[model samples]
Target: LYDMNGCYSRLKELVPTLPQNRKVSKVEILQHVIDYIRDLQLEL
Candidate 1:
């Protein structure tokens, strides 16, 4: 549980598009990360 929390924090830091006012779940974080990666890949 502690490690998962740490990973969430890291994901939040890495994903810039996440809103500051909204509280997101782990699944939402992962979705956002996936979308962000896809966008980056499209750029390359």
Candidate 2:
């Protein structure tokens, strides 16, 4: 995982973005991003 940029720095970048201060588990974080993209409301 360390050899991939998407696995390390990409994950590191999201640490401060969540409104809640609590940290997320790795699997949950990935699904969170997928949900975020799927629920976007740009069409309004």
Candidate 3:
């Protein structure tokens, strides 16, 4: 199984790269994560 928990933690590292003046919800983050994993799956 893929280490999804680790992936989530690593994805949070991008928070600093996001708009400094805006707020990002956990829901949005998780959604982007799902999108990213799907894209990776397609590539594989």
In terms of lDDT, the best-performing candidate is 1
RMSD of each: 2.3, 4.3, 5.5
The sequence of per-residue lDDT tens digits that candidate 3 reaches over residues 1-44 is 43976665667775444444556576777776677777779999
Model 1 error, position 28 (Å): 0.7
Model 1 misplaced regions, further than 4 Å: none
Instruction: Give me candidate 2's TM-score against the actual structure.
Output: 0.45
After superposition, candidate 3 runs with Cα above 4 Å error: 1-9, 14-21
Which stretches of model 2 miss by more than 4 angstroms? 1-19, 41-44
RMSD in angstroms between candidate 3 and the native structure over all alpha carbons: 5.5
- For each candidate, what TM-score against the reference? 0.85, 0.45, 0.53
Number of the predicted model whose TM-score against the real structure is largest: 1
Candidate 1 clash pair list: none
Which 10-residue span in candidate 1 carries the lowest summed lDDT? 1-10
Cα lDDT of all candidates, in order?
Answer: 0.91, 0.59, 0.65
**lDDT (tens digit, per residue) of candidate 2 on 1-44:** 46664774565465444436566676666676666556565543
Model 2 alpha-carbon miss at residue 22, Å: 0.9
Range of the 10 consecutive residues with the lowest summed lDDT in candidate 3: 14-23
Q: Please say which candidate is ahead in lDDT: 1 or 2.
A: 1
- Candidate 1 on 1-44: residue-level lDDT in tens? 54978989988998999878899988999999999999999999
